Amino acid sequence: NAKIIGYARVSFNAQKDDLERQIQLIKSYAEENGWDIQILKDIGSGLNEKRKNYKKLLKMVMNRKVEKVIIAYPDRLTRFGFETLKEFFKSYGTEIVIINKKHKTPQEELVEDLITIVSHFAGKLYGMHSHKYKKLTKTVKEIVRE
Amino acid sequence: AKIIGYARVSFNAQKDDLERQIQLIKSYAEENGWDIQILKDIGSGLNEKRKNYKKLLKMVMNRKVEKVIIAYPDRLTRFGFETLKEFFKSYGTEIVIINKKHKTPQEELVEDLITIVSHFAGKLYGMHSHKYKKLTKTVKEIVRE
C-alpha cells in the first residue's frame, strides 16, 4: 500500500535494551502523528548488507510499497552508503525520517566495525595471518579495546 | 536501451590505469556486439559524490541503462556493492564485471584504509584530539612504508 515502516538495530545482543529503546522512540513517534506502523529490526552490524529484516525492508521499498522509513539515526540503517540509499529511496517515492539526527552512536559498534574493516583491508594488503596482517590488526585492536 | 562503461582510479598519478580500464571496457563491448558510452571519475570508491558516478546512478533511476560494464567490482564502489547491484536490478540494469579476480591497486587500499580510520577515529574520540591523532598516525606509519 502506502505503508509506514520503522527500522531499528544494534550489532550485539548485549545492546538489546538499547534496541527496545529505539523501538519505543519510533513507536511513540508514529503514535504522536497518528500513524499505523510496522516495525522491523535486526541484531547485526550496519556493515552487513545481508541483514534479514533490512533486506525485507529494501525489497518493500523497491516494490513501491513504502511511503516513509522511520529511523532513530542514520547509522542504524547502514554504516556506509546512506546517501546512495536515500537517493534510491526517493526514486521509489520513499522518504527517510530521522528522529534524532545528532544522537550519540554506540561506541562499541564504532570499535567493532573498525576492527572488522581493518581486518578486511589488512587481508587484501598483506594476506591473512601474514606478519604485516598480524602487526596492523593487533596494533589497532590494542588501541581501541582499552 | 543504453550500455555504460564505468572506469575509476583514485589519483591523478593513476591516469594510465584509468585508460587501461577504458580500453578493456571498449574492446569487451566491441567483441560482444555492444554499443557503449564511457563514464569516468578520478576519485575514491568511498566517495558517494563522484560526479559521473552520481550521473550514472541518476541514469539508472531514469531507466536509461541496460548494462553497466566495469573492470572489477571496487571500481564502482568500495562498499555497498551488493545493495547497489540490487537497486540496479530493480531498474532493469545489469552489472557486467570483466575481470572478477583482478588485483585491486595497493595504494587505493592504503588510502581508503587511512580515510576509513580517520572517519572512525573522529567519531570515536573527536576530530584532532589526542586519541584521534594516536590512532590515525599509528595506522598511517604502518601502511605507508
CATH number of the CATH domain containing B85: 3.40.50.1390
Q: For residues B6 and B48, state if they share a domain.
A: yes
Resolution in A: 2.2
**Domain CATH for A127:** 1.10.287.2170
Helices A131-144, B130-143: crossing angle, 10 deg rounding: 180
Counted domains in chain A: 2
AA identity, residue B11 = F
In order of A115, A126, A138, B33, B67, the CA distances from A112 in angstroms are 5, 21, 13, 47, 36
Domain that holds residue A116: 102-146
Q: Which three cell numbers stand for residue B100?
A: 572478477
Q: For residues B118 and B70, state if they share a domain.
A: no
Question: Positive or negative CA dihedral for A68, A73, A75, A80?
Answer: positive
- DSSP states along A107-122: HHHHHHHHHHHHHHHH
Q: B91 φ, ψ to 5°?
A: -105, 20
Cβ pairs A/B, distance under 8 A: 85
Q: For residues B77 and B117, state if they share a domain.
A: no
Q: A79 φ, ψ to 5°?
A: -75, -50
CA distance A49 to B118: 22
Q: For residues B64 and B1, state if they share a domain.
A: yes
Q: For residues B108 and B133, state if they share a domain.
A: yes
Method of determination used here = X-ray
Q: For residues A71 and A133, state if they share a domain.
A: no
Cβ atoms within 10 Å of A145's Cβ, excluding its own: 9
In sequence order, what are the residues at sequence separation of 6 or more whose Cβ sits closer than 8 angstroms to the Cβ of residue A25? A72, A99, A100
In sequence order, what are the residues at sequence separation of 6 or more whose Cβ sits closer than 8 angstroms to the Cβ of residue A124? B104, B109
Q: For residues A7 and A27, state if they share a domain.
A: yes
Hey, which residues does B22 pair with through a beta bridge? none
Say if CB A121 and CB B134 are below 8 A apart.
no
Kindly state the greatest CA–CA separation across chain B. 58
Contact flag A144-B124 (C-beta cutoff 8 Å): yes
CA distance A2 to B88: 23
Say if CB A76 and CB A69 are below 8 A apart.
no
Strands B94-97 and A66-71: unpaired
Cβ atoms within 10 Å of A79's Cβ, excluding its own: 24
In order of A87, B7, B75, B90, the CA distances from B61 in angstroms are 9, 19, 20, 9
DSSP SS3 for A9:
strand
Q: For residues B2 and B66, state if they share a domain.
A: yes
Say if CB B7 and CB B40 are below 8 A apart.
yes
Hey, which residues does B36 pair with through a beta bridge? B3
Interface-testing mutation among A117, A132, A137, A141, with chain B (most B C-beta atoms within 10 A): A117
- DSSP states along B44-106: -TT-TT-HHHHHHHHHHHTT--SEEEESSGGGT-SS-HHHHHHHHHHTT-EEEES-TTPPPPH
Q: Which of B14, B40, B7, B6 has the alpha carbon at shortest distance from B109?
A: B14
In sequence order, what are the residues at sequence separation of 6 or more whose Cβ sits closer than 8 angstroms to the Cβ of residue B131? A143, B121, B124, B125
- Grid cell 540503517 is found at A77
- DSSP states along A33-101: TT---EEEEEES-TT-TT-HHHHHHHHHHHTT-EEEEEESSHHHH-SS-HHHHHHHHHHTT-EEEES-S
Q: For residues B2 and B15, state if they share a domain.
A: yes
Say if CB B94 and CB B67 are below 8 A apart.
yes
- Grid cell 537497486 is found at B87
Q: Which residues of A touch B49 (CB under 8 A)?
A: 83
DSSP SS3 for A139:
helix
Contact flag A58-B120 (C-beta cutoff 8 Å): no
In order of A134, A137, B134, the CA distances from A142 in angstroms are 12, 9, 12
CA distance B63 to B66: 8
Q: Which three cell numbers stand for residue B139?
A: 595506522
Q: For residues B80 and B112, state if they share a domain.
A: no
In sequence order, what are the residues at sequence separation of 6 or more whose Cβ sits closer than 8 angstroms to the Cβ of residue A106? A10, A11, A15, A18
Q: Which three cell numbers stand for residue B141?
A: 606509519
Q: Which residues of A touch B142 (CB under 8 A)?
A: 132, 135-136, 139
- Grid cell 533490512 is found at A54
Q: Least CA distance to B144: which residue of chain A? A: A125
Cβ atoms within 10 Å of B107's Cβ, excluding its own: 15
Q: Which three cell numbers stand for residue A124?
A: 587484501
Q: Which three cell numbers stand for residue A61?
A: 521499498
Hey, which residues does A144 pair with through a beta bridge? none
Q: For residues B24 and B89, state if they share a domain.
A: yes
Q: For residues B6 and B67, state if they share a domain.
A: yes
CB-nearest partner of A84 from B48, B82, B104: B48
- Grid cell 555504460 is found at B4
CA distance B13 to B17: 9
Say if CB B5 and CB B37 are below 8 A apart.
yes
CA distance A23 to A37: 11
